[PDB]
């Protein structure tokens, strides 16, 4: 299965074998186990390593982003939009950046909530709201107004949902240009190296657009949508050191120089 | 399956074969592939052509039309009606017009939303609304009023739905008079060619009627219904050039003369 | 009385079931599949067959 | 056409079924399992094999 190695009994040793010494310089770890340093008893260790698998580590639905929109506004400007970007969120970004390359399907869940704005209006009783979430791939028609024809959605996928129902859910298959998504990119968009530098040169994953599909009502409402990401069937390659510096930007890896550990009084101190 | 043709390795050639030259005048395309022009390596191309299939191209639910009705009005005039016409919507019409003839089943989905009208009424708290959508084939009885007997619906199909439930859905089998629906019709309704000319001579697909099935309440409400179309099991024939001009009318193909491409500074310019 | 067929998968790295619940074939979900192609009716609608390696004329 | 497999259980003290309802493999639930491990590519990336009991040098 994925059982941890067990322990073999080990008696006294007096020999030329030297499991205790090695050469770290060679670039490999020591394979020494307790049976090589102290006398041991047999232990039938029945523990497994299932939670350490990559799939379990990543398959949780993380909040990635949220934004808002209103049911009143100026000249049709009542929709929210968001460029897909998984680097705007500190916790998910950190986990994803542990692997240089990854290939996975992505499951999305949306959580849609709303509230009342302060108003002087009496008679605000209103029908249940329905929301539209639309995805526009790069180069598609773009909404400029909530009542634009761009919302007809003849091809672009979209989801319509009424408040009170279970939150919306949908599956997105792996979509890269290459054979894996890159978490890092040590390069430039252009051959003359005059464009941007780094990971954002590859980010051309489209934009979500969101709006109410009801008409307006006198009572003002503000809505918030949280977008959750759950990678599935994830295969990863080339692990990397976790970041110590705090993230500054979603578009790059700029950082504030940071120490490697909290300090302490001395090298022999027990109080860390 | 539907795999793209792969690439065969190709070495140097010195012969009388001339894959490079042909006669476009003959009305067929060249069959030349890279192996015929340059030295190639073998490539096991594993790409498929599934999204290019006609079924995938068309099977998306497009908004075709929407209209409104109110819960108050004059002399029973509180219902909406719509003549079935798939040419009133620019994006869907464009996709459908790519084929001269098509045969398909149609799945419909309705999205029903509502809002409050400005009012001076206090005490507008109201019960959940239920809506009736009825289809009246050509020659059926017609509603003239929301309380007309024409809404009894003894035979005509109809759907009743309460707000908050999932949006209504229904399947319509292929219904043409002929063996395919025509997208174009180069002809006249009458033998003396005195009726209308073009595609609208064949459009006799019936009308939808819509209303609330609650009684009125003092608080005024306006409702909007969006009708979505998703063709299924679609077989098509005789492809056509996509339109360049913008649509003007739903009943015909009149157009504003339009150029064939955006211009540029010169024939050798890279900046298009 | 369900049929069993395959899911679309990525190439160069699975079954699902399908039961019909209605008496009308119009109620079935879309017939999405790889099908087949035959472009020759549009790309080579010619009575006299052309050979790729040969001159088109004579 | 469901498959039958086992549930994770505690060691040193059961089946469940799984049917796919979609035509796209992307619709399947996560592939959680014990898999396998092969840490040697990261812990022992060395051309000349080291023996645990032997000196590293000579």
């Amino acid at each position: 299965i994925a059982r941890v190695a067990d322990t073999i009994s080990s008696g006294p040793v007096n020999s030329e074998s030297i499991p205790a010494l090695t050469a770290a310089e060679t670039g490999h770890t020591s394979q020494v186990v307790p049976a090589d340093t102290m006398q041991t008893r047999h232990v039938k260790n029945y523990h497994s390593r299932s939670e350490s698998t990559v799939e379990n580590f990543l398959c949780r639905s993380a909040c990635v982003y949220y934004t808002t929109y209103k049911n009143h506004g100026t000249d049709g400007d009542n929709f929210a939009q968001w460029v897909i970007n998984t680097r705007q969120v500190a916790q998910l970004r950190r986990k994803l950046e542990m692997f240089t390359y990854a290939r996975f399907d992505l499951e999305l869940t949306f959580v849609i909530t709303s509230s009342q704005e302060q108003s002087t209006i009496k008679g605000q009783d209103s029908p249940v709201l329905t929301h539209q979430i639309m995805y526009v791939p790069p180069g598609g028609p773009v909404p400029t107004k909530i009542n634009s024809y761009s919302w007809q959605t003849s091809t672009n996928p979209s989801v319509f949902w009424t408040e009170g129902s279970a939150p919306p859910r949908i599956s997105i298959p792996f979509i890269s240009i290459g054979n894996a998504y890159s978490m890092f990119y040590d390069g430039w968009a252009r051959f003359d190296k005059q464009g941007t530098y780094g990971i954002n040169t590859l980010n051309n994953m489209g934009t979500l657009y969101m709006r109410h599909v009801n008409d307006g009502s006198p009572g003002p409402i503000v809505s918030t949508v949280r977008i959750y990401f759950k990678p599935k069937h994830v295969k990863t390659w080339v692990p990397r050191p976790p970041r110590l510096c705090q993230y500054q930007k979603a578009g790059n890896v700029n950082f504030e120089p940071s120490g490697v550990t909290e300090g302490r009084t001395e090298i022999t101190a027990m109080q860390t | 399956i539907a795999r793209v043709a792969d690439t065969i390795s190709s070495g140097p050639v010195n012969s009388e074969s001339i894959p490079a030259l042909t006669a476009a005048e003959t009305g067929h395309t060249s069959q030349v592939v890279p192996a015929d022009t340059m030295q190639t390596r073998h490539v096991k191309n594993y790409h498929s052509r599934s999204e290019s299939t006609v079924e995938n191209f068309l099977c998306r639910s497009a908004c075709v039309y929407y209209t409104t009705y109110k819960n108050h009005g004059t002399d029973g005039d509180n219902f909406a009606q719509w003549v079935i016409n798939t040419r009133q919507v620019a994006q869907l019409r464009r996709k459908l017009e790519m084929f001269t003839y098509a045969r398909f089943d149609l799945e419909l989905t309705f999205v029903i939303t509502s809002s409050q009208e400005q009012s001076t009424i206090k005490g507008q708290d109201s019960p959940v609304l239920t809506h009736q959508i009825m289809y009246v084939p050509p020659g059926g009885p017609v509603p003239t009023k929301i309380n007309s007997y024409s809404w009894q619906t003894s035979t005509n199909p109809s759907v009743f739905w309460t707000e908050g439930s999932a949006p209504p859905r229904i399947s319509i089998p292929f219904i043409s008079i002929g063996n395919a629906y025509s997208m174009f019709y180069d002809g006249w309704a009458r033998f003396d060619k005195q009726g209308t000319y073009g595609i609208n001579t064949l459009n006799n697909m019936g009308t939808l009627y819509m209303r609330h099935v609650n009684d009125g309440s003092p608080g005024p409400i306006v409702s909007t219904v969006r009708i979505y179309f998703k063709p299924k099991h679609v077989k098509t024939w005789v492809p056509r050039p996509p339109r360049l001009c913008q649509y003007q009318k739903a009943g015909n193909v009149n157009f504003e003369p339009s150029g064939v491409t955006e211009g540029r500074t010169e024939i050798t310019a890279m900046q298009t | 009385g369900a049929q069993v067929s395959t899911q679309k998968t990525g190439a160069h790295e699975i079954h699902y079931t399908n039961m019909n619940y209605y008496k009308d074939s119009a109620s079935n979900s879309a017939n999405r599949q790889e099908f087949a192609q035959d472009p020759g009716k549009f790309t080579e609608p010619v009575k006299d067959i052309m050979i790729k390696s040969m001159p088109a004329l004579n | 056409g469901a498959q039958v497999s086992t549930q994770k259980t505690g060691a040193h003290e059961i089946h469940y079924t799984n049917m796919n309802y979609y035509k796209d493999s992307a619709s399947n639930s996560a592939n959680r399992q014990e898999f396998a491990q092969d840490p040697g590519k990261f812990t022992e990336p060395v051309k000349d094999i080291m023996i645990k009991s032997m000196p590293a040098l000579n």
């Binding site: - | - | 019909n20 109620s27 979900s29 | -």
Partner: peptide, 21 residues
């Protein structure tokens, strides 16, 4: 009747789907 549980995504309208009706 058979005990069931509804998952997320219930009662939603997706413009790109495959269901019977």
């Amino acid at each position: 009747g058979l005990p069931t549980m509804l998952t997320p995504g219930s009662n939603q309208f997706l413009t790109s789907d495959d269901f019977q009706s």
